[PDB]
Design a protein around this ligand. Structure first.
Ligand SMILES: *[C@@H]1O[C@H](CO)[C@@H](O[C@@H]2O[C@H](CO)[C@@H](O[C@@H]3O[C@H](CO)[C@@H](O)[C@H](O)[C@@H]3O)[C@H](O)[C@H]2NC(C)=O)[C@H](O)[C@H]1NC(C)=O
Ligand code: NAG
Lengths: 49, 206, 167, 317
């Protein structure tokens, strides 16, 4: 993190302080696919047969 | 001495101006660094666009680079005008302080720094003005027994100026901004009401 | 990643803290943003918490003092972000840091009353903001402090006057 | 505002395309940070009028004055005064928009405010410099009247009037704040203007600005990459323009807010910690005293003045 600060500042001297060096994000690892009841019969069930 | 020693040994002491000049220098350097951006165009250099694309195609990329550069400048100019308004307010404040603290004695509370304003002096600066503000501030005080008035022959005598205070044996008049006991005399008082009217009235011959 | 009957976005599901009227599957926050979704198969509702995010900043002493630093990860768990000195607060996760329940004047903010500084080994320590020493000055309605000893102090201020005449 | 989050919705292909426009929103991430810093500096200029936090005496020997209706209540979950609560409780995500906290919270502002109230109530005007001094409140009043060209004789003749008239005025202020929503308008408009501007940035994300789609990621999956690049650049341009417009408006507002807070700081030096004789400066009359209170996004004052009530016209020379 000190090197992160030196590279955000483009300085080899860092004064006491708070520096913004990056950005942290939580990334998705999985997915949820949710759809309505497939019990509501589709007319293809009437066209065929 | 302390001011010069601080300014010369603690670079952040100069920060009030360093930020102004650094922000302006950065804004100009930013306009320059941004010239390498192509703003999504096929090339960042308009002369490359002209040699690279036949004019009917070059016009699309020509306009895109110009628009990108134009917007960077529009942002710059807009911010500069906003800064100009703030800087003008500062310049007006500097002129005000010269009237209030340099050539006169303002009583505005802590206007040019903590205390009463005795004097002040301007110095030049690139992009600004520097002031040395000289103020009068209490260091040590004694807490005296007090009363709003002194009782004399049944009457309430109020200070014509100052406040009535006591050191444990005798009453005297001092000022809010200085200990300098005066003897209470009829020439130093105003009578209003009586010794029953003033709450906390004390006895001391006038 | 989500797809609820064609509605997409990202987040973390938790059991809902609000009821829905029978009219709706999708509940929303200010500026029409999905807050919660009734599950298409199960008659239960879950809230969608955005996947946490924020900036990353380094809390550091000067390099003229030491190379010991801590990193603040805003609005996240330390379990999502890692050395031995790991401290979790409400504002974010500090790695290379500890915490003390006392308040101090501070140079570096974390936010919401939470401070940071480099202190004794000399890890970054999270602290409460003190607002200065508490001057519990005594007062009385029969006593006046009258200044006797005064000094003349000189202070400084530098004001902006003009900008670069940019052309 | 995380402009890459606002624009992309966590899309890898979008991020690679955002870079094509360089720094158009990067400079706004910087401007927004700068605004937040300026807003913290402004909070300090108006409330940090006391060098360190000071406290009121344990015994409220305030001369019959109900200063307890101004000062915060330490026994509550929210250490606020009735005035602070009347304004506070009336005045009012995955899109990349978050709000940073203040370091100095409203409760902590109220704590510095309490110190300033302690100062003007028991130290008087002298609180501004040197060690805090002690002056009996009744004697501060004799001074405050002489300080405005009004003989102190009024205090001794009308000691009860002075405490009662002040207390009556404070009660009227609390009654106004609690019953007349427009009384809080000076701040309610401020919070609504900022909330509306932010709600606008969010609502506008749904606009396609004439592009094939309002959702960048939809454009990316819908069109082959070289076609997507054009429609994405178009959607991005509209999004960049929106945040740039927002920031400019906030920079202008920041300047106006600082001017108002600087005025508030001035009134603190002139009415809270002094006796200004300026005509109608902190309201009609002469300034005897004033008391600060905290507010969400703001500062509140009770400006106390000497106002002639009845008069007669005499032959003069
Ligand atoms: C839509 O299709 C789904 C799939 O079958 C149906 O949802 C199911 O509803 C049943 C009845 O409530 C649930 O069974 C219950 O399970 C709980 C514990 O899991 C148990 O305590 C109960 O005794 C009962 O057995 C089942 O969990 C649920 N499954 C899913 C995947 O949602 C639903 O009935 C269909 N909706 C219709 C036909 O309208
Ligand atoms: C028609 O019946 C046949 C024979 O069981 C079956 O394979 C097919 O799935 C049926 N189609 C429909 C639409 O029910």
């Amino acid at each position: 993190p000190l090197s992160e600060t030196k590279c955000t500042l483009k300085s080899f001297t860092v004064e006491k302080g708070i520096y913004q060096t990056s950005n942290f994000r939580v990334q998705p690892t999985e997915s949820i696919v949710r759809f309505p009841n497939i019990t509501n019969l589709c007319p293809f069930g009437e066209v065929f047969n | 001495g302390k001011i010069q020693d601080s300014l010369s040994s603690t670079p952040s002491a100069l920060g009030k101006l360093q930020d102004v000049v650094n922000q302006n220098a950065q804004a100009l350097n930013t306009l320059v660094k941004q010239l390498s951006s192509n703003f999504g165009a096929i090339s960042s250099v308009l002369n490359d666009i002209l040699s690279r694309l036949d004019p009917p195609e070059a016009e699309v990329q020509i306009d895109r680079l110009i628009t990108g550069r134009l917007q960077s400048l529009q942002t710059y100019v807009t911010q500069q005008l906003i800064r100009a308004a703030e800087i003008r307010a500062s310049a007006n404040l500097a002129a005000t302080k010269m009237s209030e603290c340099v050539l006169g004695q303002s009583k505005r509370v802590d206007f040019c720094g903590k205390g009463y304003h005795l004097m002040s002096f301007p110095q030049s600066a690139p992009h600004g003005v520097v002031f040395l503000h000289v103020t009068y501030v209490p260091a040590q005080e004694k807490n005296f027994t007090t009363a709003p008035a002194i009782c004399h022959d049944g009457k309430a005598h109020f200070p014509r100026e100052g406040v009535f205070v006591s050191n444990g044996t005798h009453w005297f008049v001092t000022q809010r901004n200085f200990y300098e006991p005066q003897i209470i005399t009829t020439d130093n008082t105003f009578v209003s009401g009586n010794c029953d009217v003033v709450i906390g009235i004390v006895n001391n011959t006038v | 990643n989500f797809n609820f009957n064609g509605l997409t976005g990202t987040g973390v599901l938790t059991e809902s803290n609000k009821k829905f009227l029978p009219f709706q599957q999708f509940g929303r926050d200010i500026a029409d943003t999905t807050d919660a979704v009734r599950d298409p198969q199960t008659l239960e509702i879950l809230d969608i918490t955005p996947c946490s995010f924020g900036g990353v900043s380094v809390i550091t002493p000067g390099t003229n003092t030491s190379n010991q630093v801590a990193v603040l990860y805003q609005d996240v768990n330390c379990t999502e972000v890692t050395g031995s000195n790991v401290f979790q607060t409400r504002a974010g996760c500090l790695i290379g840091a500890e915490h003390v329940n006392n308040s101090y004047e501070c140079d570096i903010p974390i936010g919401a009353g939470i401070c940071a500084s480099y202190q004794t080994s000399q890890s970054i320590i999270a602290y409460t903001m003190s607002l200065g020493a508490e001057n519990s000055v005594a007062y009385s309605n029969n006593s006046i402090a009258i200044p006797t000893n005064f000094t003349i102090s000189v202070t400084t201020e530098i004001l902006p006057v003009s900008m670069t005449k940019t052309s | 505002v995380d402009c890459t989050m606002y624009i992309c919705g966590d899309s890898t292909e979008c991020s690679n395309l955002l870079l094509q426009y360089g720094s158009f929103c990067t400079q706004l991430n910087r401007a927004l940070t700068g605004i937040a810093v300026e807003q913290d500096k402004n909070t300090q200029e108006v409330f940090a009028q006391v060098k360190q936090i000071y406290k009121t005496p344990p015994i409220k020997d305030f001369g019959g004055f109900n200063f307890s209706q101004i000062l915060p209540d330490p026994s509550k979950p929210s250490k606020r005064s009735p005035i602070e609560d009347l304004l506070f409780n009336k005045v009012t995500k995955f899109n990349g928009l978050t709000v940073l906290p203040p370091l100095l919270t409203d409760e902590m502002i109220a704590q510095y405010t309490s110190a300033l109230l302690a100062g003007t109530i028991t130290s008087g005007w002298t609180f501004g410099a040197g060690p805090a001094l002690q002056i009996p409140f009744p004697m501060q009043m004799a001074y405050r009247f002489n300080g405005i060209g009004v003989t102190q004789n009024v205090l001794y003749e009308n000691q009860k009037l002075i405490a009662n008239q002040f207390n009556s005025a404070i009660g009227k202020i609390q009654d106004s704040l609690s019953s007349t929503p427009s009384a809080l308008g000076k701040l309610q408009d401020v919070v609504n203007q900022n909330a509306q501007a932010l709600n606008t940035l969010v609502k506008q994300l749904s606009s396609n600005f004439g592009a094939i789609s309002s959702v960048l990621n939809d454009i990316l999956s819908r069109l082959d990459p070289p076609e997507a690049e054009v429609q994405i650049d178009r959607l991005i341009t509209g999004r960049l323009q929106s945040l740039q417009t927002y920031v400019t408006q906030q920079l202008i507002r920041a300047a106006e807010i600082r001017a108002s807070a600087n005025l508030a700081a001035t009134k603190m030096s002139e009415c809270v910690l002094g006796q200004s004789k300026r005509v109608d400066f902190c309201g009609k009359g002469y300034h005897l005293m004033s008391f600060p209170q905290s507010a969400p996004h703001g500062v509140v004052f009770l400006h106390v003045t000497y106002v002639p009530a009845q008069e007669k016209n005499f032959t003069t020379a």
